[PDB]
């Protein structure tokens, strides 16, 4: 009933992370729908200052209906708040909780034959810190913030002096949210590493561990280095705002650019923390539905280790226009390019896995194959951006937006969906209906490409990031992008419907392994769902 939340079992914690990540994801996606309503056409029609003089509730409902421009005073602060909320929720409160907190907690112990995490009580606390962080993030949207309004309009990376001069305490609430997220992540990482190292089953040697378990292990190490650095960066923002320090304020001999070095030291590793567990899921899924063992097991592990390590020495590719010396720029450009090599090894090995196989195009496999194509499109755009000389033009334009949505919303998220369809039978004892899984895939596939591919054009034409409104010439591709986002949203609501149907009246799962023998890890050896106590 209500002891779902006081449970210390890795399977229950994993389910709670998945559901919660899903719900926050819905909230953050709803924000992007409203964003794309405003970007659908030039001129501001929705985010009108006039809506501020109503109730909180009435104002909300009025802001969902378009006004004529002559009746709509543009409210840039609300745009900035929405965007900041969207980003913070995704990067801290959705995708890592789903992959790492969710599938990680559920499946890693199963994959290594551990009965539970090393410290189950710590694991339960991990979850509550995530919920507390989320609540603070959400509350920040309703707290006194910038420009005498509610909410922080400062961007998900909180650059000073903008972030340190924003009025109200909304920004302080956001900083505390992020601290709580980091704490949740660190506790999780402690558990994953200890469990992985100590609690493997007899015979389960380091080079017998499934790739998903490896992806979680490597990810956990990245969290231990990256998240403490972030805790430092944002604490310094907090003291600049409230306790008289001057770390980032030039009047006291501070330097705003220093914040950027510290923040991006976390900020790059953050994206590899997002995508590594998705690499792990893709390996399991492609092996299963190709009916063929994963190609190059050892290079797959070492490629993940290499990506992880390299992800710590590239941060200033986020700072090419911020005053970096030509030497710094040249170094970070070359260091970044190297990442394409181990990543390329993983993409080719996934294709090599399919080669000579017996391919079954079930829903999980569709997500995996979409991932290969779409993550490649995003990764290759990331290589464009590593070239400082071209980044001169693209930096803080929609080309960057297109990059990161291809790798995240058409990459990591495709990994999340692959995992859901792959494992829902195993976790619930009910099977999803196949035709609906495929329909979800195609609607999302068409919609997300329509949303983001045109943003490459917008960036090339010079459309800046974080703008409520834009010159009339950007109209066409913004319109197409918005229609794509509306279709993607329809696909997500349909997905939630598919999940609801599955858990409520989906076909009863009868087999331990309802896939095939090439799903050869320990979870497929157990009942569906597994016993409360396994191993």
């Amino acid at each position: 009933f209500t002891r779902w939340f006081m449970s210390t079992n890795h399977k229950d914690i994993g389910v709670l992370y998945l559901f919660t990540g899903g719900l926050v994801g819905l909230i953050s996606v709803a924000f992007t729908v409203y964003m794309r309503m405003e970007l659908m056409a030039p001129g501001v029609q929705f985010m009108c200052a006039e809506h501020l003089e109503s109730g909180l509730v009435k104002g909300f409902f009025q802001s969902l209906w378009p006004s004529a421009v002559e009746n709509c005073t543009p409210n840039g602060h609300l745009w900035n708040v929405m965007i900041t909320g969207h980003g913070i929720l995704m990067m801290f409160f959705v995708v890592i909780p789903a992959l790492f907190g969710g599938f990680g907690n559920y499946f890693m112990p199963l994959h290594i034959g551990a009965p539970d995490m090393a410290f189950p009580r710590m694991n339960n606390l991990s979850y509550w810190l995530y919920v507390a962080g989320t609540s603070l993030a959400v509350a920040s949207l309703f707290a006194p913030g910038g420009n005498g309004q509610l909410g922080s309009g400062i961007g998900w990376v909180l650059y000073p002096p903008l972030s340190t001069s924003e009025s109200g305490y909304s920004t302080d609430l956001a900083i505390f949210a992020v601290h709580l997220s980091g704490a949740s992540s660190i506790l999780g990482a402690i558990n994953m590493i200890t469990t992985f190292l100590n609690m493997r089953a007899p015979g389960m040697t380091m080079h017998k561990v499934p790739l998903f378990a490896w992806s979680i292990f490597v990810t956990a190490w990245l969290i231990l280095l990256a998240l403490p650095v972030l805790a430092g960066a944002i604490t310094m923002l907090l003291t600049d705002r409230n306790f008289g320090t001057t770390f980032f304020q030039p009047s006291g001999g501070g330097d705003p650019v220093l914040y950027q070095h510290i923040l991006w030291f976390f900020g790059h590793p953050e994206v590899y923390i997002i995508v590594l567990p998705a690499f792990g899921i893709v390996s399991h899924v492609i092996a299963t539905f190709a009916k063929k063992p994963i190609f190059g097991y050892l290079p797959m592990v070492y490629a993940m280790v290499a990506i992880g390590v390299l992800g710590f020495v590239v941060w200033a590719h986020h700072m090419y226009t911020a005053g970096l010396s030509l030497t710094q720029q040249s170094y970070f450009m070359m260091a970044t390019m190297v990442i394409a090599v181990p990543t390329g090894i993983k993409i080719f090995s996934w294709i090599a896995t399919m080669w000579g196989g017996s391919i079954e195009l079930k829903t999980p496999m569709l997500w995996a194959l979409g991932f290969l194509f779409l993550f490649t499109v995003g990764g290759v755009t990331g290589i464009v951006l590593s070239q400082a000389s071209v980044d001169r033009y693209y930096h803080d334009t929609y080309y960057v937006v297109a990059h990161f949505h291809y790798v995240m919303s058409l990459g990591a998220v495709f990994g999340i969906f692959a995992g859901i369809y792959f494992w829902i039978g195993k976790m619930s004892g009910r099977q999803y209906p196949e035709w609906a899984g495929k329909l979800h895939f195609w609607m999302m596939f068409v919609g997300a490409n329509l949303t983001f591919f045109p943003q490459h054009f917008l960036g090339r034409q010079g459309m800046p990031r974080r703008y409520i409104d834009y010159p009339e010439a950007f109209a066409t591709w913004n319109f197409v992008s918005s229609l794509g986002a509306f279709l993607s949203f329809a696909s997500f609501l349909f997905f939630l419907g598919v999940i609801f149907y599955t858990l409520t009246r989906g076909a009863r799962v009868t087999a331990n392994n309802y896939w095939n023998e090439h799903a050869d890890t320990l979870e497929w050896t157990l009942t569906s769902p597994p016993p409360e106590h396994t191993f």
Partner: protein, 256 residues
């Protein structure tokens, strides 16, 4: 003057180049685009072929291989070579961009919430530059009859709303302009797509960029670091004019 540096309806390419640096960006990005279009077409065709060829109906018994040394070597070395190639063309372009030459004209630019301040230290000229339609010009950041009229009066049209400012940075063609950029309050970013330039305006730091405009005209940029409520409403207008018209503009500003 011709309006050259601006987005065009339905555009999918870069803004027109009006500098040798912007020309270099177009070439380098063009070269890399061909490469990455090839990589992704390649990858995509391999996927679709493998799904067609090895579909469970057509290949009933799966192979079990997990190694292929020649191919594994090839698919490591080729990416390495592709990247070294890109590096070899990209680093010169980078060096050209970031090595600041000797200035014919020096402009110091300051970012403010939410407008730009310009100073010409050789000429003892300074002025501020606000979006036409901002509160400074009587507006509230949206189109209106009054805003359209002001755009007309300044030599623009309603199509340039959100790009055109009340005053412009004017410079002579075919001269080396060095711009020194800083921020007064928060970080802003100064940019002109047609020139292939962008540099953050950071409080407490003075950073430099250069361009040499190769044709006369009007070229727009927009502030490129989120800086608060009117981030979307503090753009950049550069007018590139003849050497004689530039001197005329200078004399117009001279106080006797």
């Amino acid at each position: 003057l011709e309006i050259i540096g601006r987005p065009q309806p339905g555009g999918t390419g870069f803004q027109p180049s009006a500098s040798p640096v912007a020309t270099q960006i177009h070439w380098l990005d063009g070269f890399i685009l061909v490469i990455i279009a090839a990589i992704t077409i390649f990858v995509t065709l391999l996927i679709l072929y493998a799904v067609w060829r090895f579909h469970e109906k057509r290949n009933k018994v799966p192979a079990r291989f997990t190694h292929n040394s020649p191919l594994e070597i090839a698919w490591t070395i080729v990416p390495i070579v592709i990247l070294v190639a890109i590096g070899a063309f990209s680093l010169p372009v980078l060096f050209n961009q970031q090595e600041i030459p000797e200035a014919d004209v020096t402009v110091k630019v300051t970012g403010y919430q939410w407008y730009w301040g310009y100073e010409y230290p050789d000429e003892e000229i300074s002025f501020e530059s606000y979006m036409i339609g901002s509160p400074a010009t009587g507006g509230d950041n949206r189109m209106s009859p009054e805003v359209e009229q002001q755009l007309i009066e300044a030599g623009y049209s309603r199509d340039e709303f959100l790009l055109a400012t009340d005053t412009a940075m004017v410079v002579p063609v075919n001269k080396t302009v060095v711009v020194q950029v800083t921020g007064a309050d928060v970080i802003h970013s100064w940019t002109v797509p047609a020139f292939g330039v962008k540099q953050d305006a950071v409080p407490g730091r003075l950073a430099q960029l250069w361009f040499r405009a190769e044709r006369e005209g009007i070229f727009f940029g927009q502030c490129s670091e989120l800086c608060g409520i009117s981030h979307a409403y503090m753009p950049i207008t550069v007018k590139v004019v003849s050497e004689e018209a530039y001197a005329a503009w200078l004399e117009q500003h001279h106080h006797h």
